[PDB]
Structures are given as structure tokens and as C-alpha cells.
């Protein structure tokens, strides 16, 4: 099974991706997590991403495409995968389409702009795994610790209000058109498309997604 998650920044995509991955035994493919890891380790492909993410700007189509095609050739992607953060632009989507990569589900998360900032400012992550928490809305079992490893959570350098505003602007301009792109794909019988209310509690959105996938 192959899935793509659509939605504005902080809509809850990464959060819900964790549940799908464990349930369906398919790997989460997060371009945001790769880019941050590349910066961290200084990987040839992705190292350059530091300043761009800082400014709240999108990284080049070609860099991310390369990261995805490299990552997606991996063996763990034999039986399917979940795309989370890719595609982010129309050319990114088209690159994937003409490579002959079709998916089964495109899942859109519907979340109002006014909720995004307070979500992102309270976000805490476990960098090694990509697991995400919220200090008020979705806290770890033990404060400041990852549930799975118990390791100290951190805050992303680009999770400040001003930076978040910029990502929003970028999304509505560059990424929003992907909704129509895949709605069109769905009508061609190339995939199934669905939208969920991303303002429900984490448990409920997970249940909604499972009704669609299971
Ligand atoms: N394909 C690409 N092409 C070019 N550049 C790319 C790229 N991909 C990445 N980049 C680059 O890297 C940057 C960052 O992108 P990215 O790594 O994706 O972070 P983002 O833009 O800030 O938004 P996310 O997609 O990480 O949010 P989310 O949908 O996962 O919501 P989350 O589960 O975290 O949850 C949000 C918060 O609220 C909480 N929360 C989650 N669910 C709920 C709920 N149901 N109710 C209440 N609170 C909730 C959480 O615990 C959390 O704190 C870009 O700006 C760019 O430079």
C-alpha cells in the first residue's frame, strides 16, 4: 500500500504517519526528517538545506527529488511506503508521476491557519526517529522524553512564530495546488482521495484515517 499525506504545516501529518507506518508495516518517507538529518550529519546530498529551512523557505525541487528517489529505492519500500512532505510542489508531483510511481491513497488534512502557530511553537521532537510531541496538545508520557527510547526531546530551530508564518505563505503558494492535482488523479481512477478534519483529537483523526485505509 502506498500513501501520500497532504496538508499545511503543523496539520498533524507526521503525527498520524506514525500510526499508519506501524499498522501497515510501510516506512514513513519524511523529506523534512531527511533534510534535517543531512544537515546534522553533513551528508553530501542535503547538507545545503540548513539556511533554506531557517528562512522558512522551500528547498529546491531537484535536491528533494534526489533524496526521495534515493530513499525510496531502499529495500524497506518493497511492499509500499508513506510519503510525508513529498511532493511539496507541482514539479515534484510530476517528477514522480512520469517516473511511473502511482499511489493508492492521497490523504488531505484540513486545518485552519489560526491553529498552526500555537501548534508549532509547542512542538518537541525526537530527532533520531522523527517522532513528534506537543507540550500541551500531545505530551510525552514523561516530560521532555521520547516515549519509545526515553531520550531527551528537542525543539526544531525553525519552529518559531515568524518562521512558521513564512512556511504558511510558501504552502498556500507552492503546495496547496497539489490538492487539485491529486483530486484530478483520483478522478482518473489513478488513486483514491480523501480529506479529514485535522482539528479532531489525535486519537480521532487516527480512527478516521483507519476507516479510510483499513
Ligand atoms: N518535499 C520538500 N520539498 C522542498 N522542501 C522541503 C520538502 N520537505 C521539507 N522541506 C524543507 O524542510 C522544512 C520543514 O518541513 P516539515 O519537516 O514538514 O515541517 P513543517 O513545514 O513545519 O510542517 P510539518 O509537515 O512537519 O507538520 P505536520 O503535518 O507533520 O504536523 P505535526 O505531526 O508535526 O504536529 C504539529 C504540532 O501540533 C501537535 N499535533 C499533532 N496532531 C494534533 C491534533 N490532532 N490536535 C492538536 N495538536 C496536534 C503536535 O504534537 C505538534 O507539536 C521546509 O519548510 C523546507 O525548507
UniProtKB/Swiss-Prot annotation:
Keyword set, alphabetical order: Acetylation, ATP-binding, Cytoplasm, Kinase, Nucleotide biosynthesis, Nucleotide-binding, Transferase
Effect on the protein of changing residue 13 to Q: Drastic reduction in enzyme activity
Binding-site list for AMP: 31, 36, 57-59, 85-88, 92, 156, 167
Entry's EC annotation: 2.7.4.3
Molecular function terms, GO-annotated: adenylate kinase activity; AMP binding; ATP binding; magnesium ion binding; nucleoside diphosphate kinase activity
Cited Pfam families: ADK (PF00406), ADK_lid (PF05191)
Gene3D superfamilies with a match to the protein in the record: P-loop containing nucleotide triphosphate hydrolases (3.40.50.300)
Annotated pathway: Purine metabolism; AMP biosynthesis via salvage pathway; AMP from ADP: step 1/1
InterPro entries: Adenyl_kin_sub (IPR006259), Adenylat/UMP-CMP_kin (IPR000850), Adenylat_kinase_CS (IPR033690), Adenylate_kinase_lid-dom (IPR007862), P-loop_NTPase (IPR027417)
Chief localisation class: cytoplasm
Binding residue positions for ATP: 10-15, 119, 123, 132-133, 200
Temperature section of the record: Optimum temperature is 45 degrees Celsius. Thermostable. Is half-inactivated at 52 degrees Celsius.
Residue ranges of the region described as NMP: 30-59
Residues modified to N6-acetyllysine: 192
GO biological process: adenine metabolic process; ADP biosynthetic process; AMP salvage; nucleoside diphosphate metabolic process; nucleoside monophosphate metabolic process; purine ribonucleotide interconversion
SUPFAM superfamilies in alphabetical order: P-loop containing nucleoside triphosphate hydrolases
Gene Ontology, cellular component aspect: cytoplasm; cytosol
Similarity field: Belongs to the adenylate kinase family.
Role: Catalyzes the reversible transfer of the terminal phosphate group between ATP and AMP. Plays an important role in cellular energy homeostasis and in adenine nucleotide metabolism.
HAMAP family: Adenylate_kinase_Adk (MF_00235)
Quaternary structure, from the entry: Monomer.
Domain notes for this protein: Consists of three domains, a large central CORE domain and two small peripheral domains, NMPbind and LID, which undergo movements during catalysis. The LID domain closes over the site of phosphoryl transfer upon ATP binding. Assembling and dissambling the active center during each catalytic cycle provides an effective means to prevent ATP hydrolysis.
Protein name: Adenylate kinase
Amino acid at each position: 500500500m502506498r500513501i501520500i499525506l497532504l496538508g499545511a504545516p503543523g496539520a498533524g501529518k507526521g503525527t498520524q504517519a506514525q500510526f499508519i507506518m506501524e499498522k501497515y508495516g510501510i516506512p514513513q518517507i519524511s523529506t523534512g526528517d531527511m533534510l534535517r538529518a543531512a544537515v546534522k550529519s553533513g551528508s553530501e546530498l542535503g547538507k545545503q538545506a540548513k539556511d533554506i529551512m531557517d528562512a522558512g523557505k522551500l528547498v529546491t525541487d531537484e535536491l528533494v527529488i534526489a533524496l526521495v528517489k534515493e530513499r525510496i529505492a531502499q529495500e524497506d519500500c518493497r511492499n509500499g511506503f508513506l510519503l510525508d512532505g513529498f511532493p511539496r510542489t507541482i514539479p515534484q508531483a510530476d517528477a514522480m508521476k512520469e517516473a511511473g510511481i502511482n499511489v493508492d491513497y492521497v490523504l488531505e488534512f484540513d486545518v485552519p491557519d489560526e491553529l498552526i502557530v500555537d501548534r508549532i511553537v509547542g512542538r518537541r521532537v525526537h530527532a533520531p526517529s522523527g517522532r513528534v510531541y506537543h507540550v500541551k496538545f500531545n505530551p510525552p508520557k514523561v516530560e521532555g522524553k521520547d516515549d519509545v527510547t526515553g531520550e531527551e526531546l528537542t525543539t526544531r530551530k525553525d519552529d518559531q512564530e515568524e518562521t512558521v508564518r513564512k512556511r504558511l505563505v510558501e504552502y498556500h503558494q507552492m503546495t496547496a495546488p497539489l490538492i487539485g492535482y491529486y483530486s484530478k488523479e483520483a478522478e482518473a481512477g489513478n488513486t483514491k482521495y480523501a480529506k479529514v478534519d485535522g482539528t479532531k483529537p489525535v486519537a480521532e483523526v487516527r480512527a478516521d484515517l483507519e476507516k479510510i485505509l483499513g
